[PDB]
């Protein structure tokens, strides 16, 4: 069946968290370990950052607007509905597991991004969401 | 060994106090007004020009910034209020240009993007001033510059203020050349039309990226170093170029693990309030911003009006100098001593200005205060460590110079929404002028009436009140921004981080007039 | 061996020619007007304030300068026209301050003297700008500064333009401190009242001289280093202090015996005239000013529009670059080559600007001209040899930048009484604006009438014509003075002499975009 | 942030193509021949001298190298083909000396070992040239030198070419002294007889190791610093000495994790082939050698004949410049720009030469091509970053100079087994000579016959063909070795690693003739 709104929210959160993890890896090597720039906060002076993202579900293309709240939670609006999502990645055994709350509903899954496809494996099932290629290259 | 404990500043304020309630109300109102105005400026040139810009297929400048910087990286915008009601009938949001510091490919860079929506990206005088300030910051802190050129040239109806003089438009190119000579990367991205007087920016740059849709420039002129299909591709290419810069950050100061302050920052609203007549202990602010609220005061019982000490912000060492009352001889000497000490040990300096007006005291023997403040002024001017100034209250007279005002080239300067800056208080200036005219017309035997006294006094009062407004001072580029106090710590962190890119070099002092 | 002969430039002009007669008439009229205005400015604040100043026993500032400098030494005054009709109703002769370079005890020094007659010596914004320019000159050329302080503080009704910003009043003190750190002597002579905000100047200075009639300052404050009975005694003490400076002039360029030019300088009046539409050969000017009229041209047949070569002025070597027509690609490349060559050999540079307007040619393919002029701009900006610019004709557009305008920090910049400076010609700007509005309102489907075309065009024409006036440009400090052409050689000599005080250091260039 | 993707070069070649098959056959044949010749050279002086050397108890030089270097470390031998058929009747394998770079005790060192088997270790002129080249490499890259001295002195029948001149035998000692002055370790191991003219090497060295079986040298002369029982003990002592050197490698470039190229290297055989008349895209080679096949081209659509860009090899940054056709004006300007850029950012440079002959085009207006190639030549000469040249095809005329030939001191220079090097193509030289003689003898009225034309042409053709052979060029030391293309990447890695030992210092440029 067609993927719901919440699955797309979880996938977007996972991609953002992977970007944060990469930022941490780069920070570890650098001299300036504690610089505030290395945080993935997305803070701005007197404005709240909203990032426009596009994710491909099946044939359909779905646009998510992710607002980086000050507290660290994300306010993602897709279509006419706004979802409050807070989550984190931690490693269970050897597999990266995303635990995330969407509008206060807690869900646990294991997240694998290979190439342009995000796989969320959970008890309910597997959800695959495709990052569109920039197509300016490749 | 780093295990012994240290005493921490700060006390829990009285939330039940009526004074705290009233101060909180006023400061929260000021911050809400600031946020609303910033949102309106963020909206840009207008729905008309925004729709036109989108129809041409180009991205809005804020979207350009969002895609350019690293994902989730904080972006430090500067001078969001340039041109705010500066010109009589023309609304120029953000000065028509967006300047900030952000992390691209793991490197702090200064990003300068023209806003095409505002008057087709023409260059108002304030726009030139903003750009020159940004270039100065990048030169001083040794930061790569990225230009997102969507320009329209000088605003012709105001050419006399844009073209001819030293700090006018040409200085831009001058800065570019110089920063190229000192090996500071210059990247130009021609995301708009390559109009007359615009091609100079790509030609001066070290590397170019040009969006496809002059055509002669990429194929034959060879000005183009890279050629991009559209905006997204151009931004990606820019990130790749920045990576290829072959740069590594060199820090030369000791680092310690960072720790949050012990007290919530929003309490500042209650402590400071909006009334300058009431006073407060700067130690409260210091406790709210520094790491772990740990502070090591220096000469605590001498010159109590100045508060000087050492602390850490996000693990970096800082020497903090702040006003706690009327500055005196002992305070000036303490400040000079502390500045020398910090310069010797290569520690960044942070000034907090809360200069107190002289309405309280008639004379204050300006001669001795001057004789001592001159020493502090010389010491501050000759210093070479990074200096960051923050104006949390009034700033008047030579005290502003003594506490590292704009003339003394601090790396950054911010003001809180409740500041006031002017040469003197309005009433003091009125009294001075009234006395001058009275004495003169007595000298020539003319009679001075009280009606004339009021006639001189009132316009001066209103004019000084109007000119002291933070928005008035930030409309011109007299400060790098108005910041919500609740965020102050964070901003300082970012600022200091950037200031660490440049190496710290030794300080040379003039003759210390003993 | 230095015996082989060299060909000399210059030809005898046709005195009988009607064109020469008319040009001579016009230029002589301009020079007479300039001389009359200078005399009126020299008269000072007015007979009222002059009588009051004399009654107090103090000397007039020009008399102070006359007694201070060496007997019979020439004095190079700067910016005599600052504030000329700058403010609407207030007449501010000379900007209220007198700045110049003169020889004291055999040492070139920069003298800065407040004029007490003009508004009690208050500081108008233009006065601050003039003083900052003088301090910048002294810093760059490493000249001792002598202040003759008779001040009145900031002009309160204009505080917003004098106190707060970076290039505002405080920068003065900043400069003082810096120039003390780099071992450049600072001498202050308090010849007037030590009012509020004035004591900072003596306190910052290395050495002080105070005229007796604060009293506390000499006896107890100890700010006073010397104590003089009156003005004459103070000036003598200043000369003694300057002698005690222990300084010797170090020159690092080859010197040859000087020889006068072969042709009279007044002939320039006939050659140049007052009409910019007519053109002339810059080689005539070069022949009139350089030593012995000897000139060694470089690349004479390539880029003929630019003329570049080597000569000597009062025995010093100079590289001369001047415009002889519309600048082109080849001219830009020749200029870049010549600038590199002169920088390599450590030779001072002298630019002569006679930029030609684009009214003659519609397009001139601004893209290629820009692509090449960028190289020349970069080369000029990065240069480190002393640079002196002289504007003998029109100066428009980016050509002004290419020929070392103010933005590029020439050590000096002078203009002839017939110059014009602006971003473009007036009619060109009018056409540009008319086309923009026509195209836009066509885009929105609105009709554009010819009456509207004239309505836009005429104000722009008048405004550009007014703003291009030499007096308009020199009222603001956009140039260091308007000079009679007949004296040009002499002025240059003095200027170059001063510029030789500082050592010449190596030039670093950015990436030469090939 | 380092997460955004980058496009990769390279395409899968058509294995089924007949052209690919034929090219693969030819190149594989060339490589097999090269390997066989190298094996024969490795066999050494001969079974006679090898048995004699073993009977004396001494180790063979290759065994010495094997025991000296770290276990399993790769060893980079240089100039394995020196003296290959250089002298008419005398076979001199390897030039009689073995030079290479290897890791001893974790330090890159330059090892120079005399081969006693070849003519008793006498010094042929080519041997002196090889040793001087090795010493030059070590000096430039700041590498400790280890000498395994088993010498026999100069080859007397050729003394006139070995003893007297500047680059003759004495320069060896000169280099030693200089490299000792600049603190570059000199270690000498006297593993053979200390004959006349040999003791100078131990005496010049910083430290000595002498195998027991002069006796006077260790006991009384005191030249001996260490005294070893036999070869194995001497090599162990050498490793201990190297450890005691107190040296640590200082790198000043950014490093990234290394990644293998996306395409197999052996495919190069098919792509390049052995026929120079056919051409190929250098981008294929670049894709085969650089890390991850990731390449960031610079000015792709201007001067398409030159290919310039940035890449990484084993994590180090490199700027790659290669020929893809006939060089032109735009190509030269692009190359100059790229060289300036790389020098500014302190990035090593890698040149790939595939100069195309002028047989295709009669004139090619050599004047303009020269006028532009001069700029590229100057830029390459003045550069200071490490430069490594690789000749993958033809190398003719001034293009060889422009692409950093031997005269321009690249840190290393290698050639593929299919290269050709000469001043011109043979037929072009024949035509030039024929035209010269024809025109001259026409000038004197003499008749020129076609038989004479063939008589001049044929010897020139054969001579140029013979002299262009890679083996001819490597017999003399014109290159540091002939490398199998399939190993190219690896070699470059090692080379660049060694080049990183020396610090990179700033580049000074001459006058850029615009
Ligand atoms: C360095 C040196 C030494 C010298 C120089 O640089 S000399 C440079 C000369 N400039 C040009 O040659 C650019 C002329 N512009 C154009 O060619 C275009 O306009 C663009 C490119 C700006 C894109 O703009 P666009 O075409 O996409 O939209 P538009 O609405 O047309 O944009 C707003 C409209 O610009 C009008 N406008 C008024 N004054 C100016 C002005 N000074 N510059 C530009 N535009 C202006 C404005 O009045 C109207 O809007 P309004 O007021 O009616 O609402
Ligand atoms: C650094 C920082 C951080 C801060 C500061 O520095 S805050 C400095 C405050 N200034 C003073 O505290 C000096 C107050 N002057 C005086 O005490 C005297 O005046 C002297 C000392 C100036 C000598 O002058 P004098 O007494 O010999 O003659 P006088 O004719 O009186 O001189 C002209 C008359 O000055 C009037 N006038 C108007 N505006 C000003 C003005 N801004 N400053 C001075 N004078 C002014 C003018 O209107 C009238 O002439 P007019 O217009 O009627 O013709
Ligand atoms: C620095 C300055 C300023 C000056 C000088 O340095 S002036 C140095 C003068 N040199 C000597 O004083 C060493 C004289 N050698 C000997 O004393 C020995 O020979 C040893 C030590 C070389 C060991 O060699 P060995 O004795 O173990 O074996 P051997 O077969 O004998 O070795 C091969 C045979 O060497 C013959 N041979 C021909 N030419 C030479 C030559 N120039 N040097 C050495 N040998 C040569 C070769 O023709 C024959 O072999 P071949 O050609 O018959 O097959």
From Swiss-Prot, chain A:
UniProt modified residues of type N6-acetyllysine: 81
Modified how: Acetylated.
Result of altering residue 35 to F: In MCC1D; asymptomatic form
Signal peptide positions (record): none
Subcellular location as annotated: Mitochondrion matrix
Modified residues (N6-succinyllysine): 81
Described purpose of this protein according to its UniProt entry: Biotin-attachment subunit of the 3-methylcrotonyl-CoA carboxylase, an enzyme that catalyzes the conversion of 3-methylcrotonyl-CoA to 3-methylglutaconyl-CoA, a critical step for leucine and isovaleric acid catabolism.
Subunit structure: Probably a dodecamer composed of six biotin-containing alpha subunits (MCCC1) and six beta (MCCC2) subunits. Interacts (via the biotin carboxylation domain) with SIRT4.
Disease connection: 3-methylcrotonoyl-CoA carboxylase 1 deficiency: An autosomal recessive disorder of leucine catabolism. The phenotype is variable, ranging from neonatal onset with severe neurological involvement to asymptomatic adults. There is a characteristic organic aciduria with massive excretion of 3-hydroxyisovaleric acid and 3-methylcrotonylglycine, usually in combination with a severe secondary carnitine deficiency.
Name of this chain's protein: Methylcrotonoyl-CoA carboxylase subunit alpha, mitochondrial
Organism: Homo sapiens (Human)
Covered range of the whole protein: 501 to 638 of 725
From Swiss-Prot, chains B, C, D:
UniProt name for this protein: Methylcrotonoyl-CoA carboxylase beta chain, mitochondrial
Molecular functions (GO terms): ATP binding; methylcrotonoyl-CoA carboxylase activity
Outcome recorded upon mutating residue 290 to M: In MCC2D; severe form
Function, as annotated: Carboxyltransferase subunit of the 3-methylcrotonyl-CoA carboxylase, an enzyme that catalyzes the conversion of 3-methylcrotonyl-CoA to 3-methylglutaconyl-CoA, a critical step for leucine and isovaleric acid catabolism.
Keyword presence, Transit peptide: yes
Gene Ontology CC, one term: methylcrotonoyl-CoA carboxylase complex
Illness: 3-methylcrotonoyl-CoA carboxylase 2 deficiency: An autosomal recessive disorder of leucine catabolism. The phenotype is variable, ranging from neonatal onset with severe neurological involvement to asymptomatic adults. There is a characteristic organic aciduria with massive excretion of 3-hydroxyisovaleric acid and 3-methylcrotonylglycine, usually in combination with a severe secondary carnitine deficiency.
Domain CoA carboxyltransferase N-terminal: 27-257
Gene name of the encoded protein: MCCC2
Family annotation (PANTHER family): ACETYL, PROPIONYL, PYRUVATE, AND GLUTACONYL CARBOXYLASE-RELATED, METHYLCROTONOYL-COA CARBOXYLASE BETA CHAIN, MITOCHONDRIAL
Assigned EC number: 6.4.1.4
Main enzyme class: ligase
GO BP term, example: branched-chain amino acid catabolic process
């Amino acid at each position: 069946k067609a993927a719901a709104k919440e699955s797309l929210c979880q996938a977007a959160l996972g991609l953002i968290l992977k970007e944060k993890a990469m930022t941490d890896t780069f920070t570890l090597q650098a001299h300036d370990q504690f610089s505030p720039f290395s945080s993935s906060s997305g803070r701005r002076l007197n404005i709240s950052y909203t990032r426009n993202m596009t994710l491909k579900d099946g044939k359909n293309n779905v646009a998510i607007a992710v607002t980086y709240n000050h507290d660290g939670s994300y306010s993602m609006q897709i279509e006419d509905k706004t979802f409050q999502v807070l989550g984190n990645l931690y490693s269970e055994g050897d597999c990266t597991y995303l635990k995330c709350s969407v509008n206060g509903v807690a869900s646990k899954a294991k997240l694998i991004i290979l190439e342009n496809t995000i796989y969320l494996f959970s008890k309910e099932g597997s959800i695959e969401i495709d990052i569109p290629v920039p197509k300016y290259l490749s | 060994y780093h295990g012994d404990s240290v005493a921490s500043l700060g006390t829990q304020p009285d939330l039940g106090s009526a004074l705290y309630q009233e101060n909180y109300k006023q400061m929260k109102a000021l911050v809400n007004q600031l946020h609303e105005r910033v949102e309106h400026i963020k909206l840009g040139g207008g729905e008309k020009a925004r729709a036109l810009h989108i129809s041409r297929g180009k991205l809005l400048p804020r979207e350009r910034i969002d895609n350019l910087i690293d994902p989730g990286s904080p972006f430090l915008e500067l001078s969001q209020f340039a041109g705010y009601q500066l010109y009589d009938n023309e609304e120029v949001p953000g000065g028509g240009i967006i300047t900030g510091i952000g992390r691209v490919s793991g490197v702090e860079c200064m990003i300068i993007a023209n806003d095409a929506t505002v008057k087709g990206g023409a260059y108002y005088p304030v726009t030139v001033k903003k750009q020159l300030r940004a270039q100065e910051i990048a030169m001083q802190n040794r930061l790569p510059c990225i230009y997102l050129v969507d320009s329209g040239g000088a605003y012709l109806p105001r050419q006399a203020d844009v073209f001819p003089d030293r700090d006018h438009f040409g200085r831009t190119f001058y800065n570019q050349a110089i920063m190229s000579s000192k090996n500071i990367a210059q990247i130009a991205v021609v995301m708009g039309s390559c109009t007359a007087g615009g091609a100079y920016v790509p030609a001066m740059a070290d590397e170019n990226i040009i969006v496809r849709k002059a055509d002669l420039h990429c194929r034959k002129s060879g000005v183009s170093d890279h050629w991009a299909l559209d905006d997204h591709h151009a931004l990606h290419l820019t990130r790749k170029v920045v990576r290829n810069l072959n740069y590594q950050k060199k820090l030369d100061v000791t680092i310690e693990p960072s720790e949050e302050p012990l007290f919530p920052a929003d309490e500042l609203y209650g402590i400071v309030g909006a009334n300058l007549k009431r006073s407060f202990d700067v130690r409260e602010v210091i406790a709210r911003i520094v790491d772990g609220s740990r502070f090591t005061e220096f000469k605590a019982f001498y010159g109590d009006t100045l508060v000087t000490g050492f602390a850490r912000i996000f693990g970096y060492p800082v020497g903090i100098v702040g006003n706690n009352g009327v500055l005196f001889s002992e305070s000036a000497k303490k400040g000079t001593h502390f500045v020398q000490l910090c310069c010797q040990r290569n520690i960044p300096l942070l000034f907090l200005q809360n200069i107190t007006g002289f309405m309280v005291g008639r004379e204050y023997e300006a001669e001795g205060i001057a004789k001592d403040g001159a020493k502090m002024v010389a010491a501050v001017a000759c210093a070479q460590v990074p200096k960051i100034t923050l104006i949390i209250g009034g700033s008047y007279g030579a005290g502003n110079y003594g506490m590292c005002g704009r003339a003394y080239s601090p790396r950054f300067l911010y003001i809180w929404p409740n500041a006031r800056i002017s040469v003197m208080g309005g009433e003091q200036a009125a009294n001075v002028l009234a006395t001058i005219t009275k004495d003169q017309r007595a000298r020539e035997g003319k009679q001075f009436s009280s009606a004339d006294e009021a006639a001189l006094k009132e316009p001066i009062i209103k004019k000084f009140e109007e000119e002291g407004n933070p928005y008035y001072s930030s409309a011109r580029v007299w400060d790098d921004g108005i910041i919500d106090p609740a965020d102050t710590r964070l901003v300082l962190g970012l600022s200091f981080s950037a200031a660490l890119n440049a190496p710290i070099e030794k300080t040379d002092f003039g003759i210390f007039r003993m």
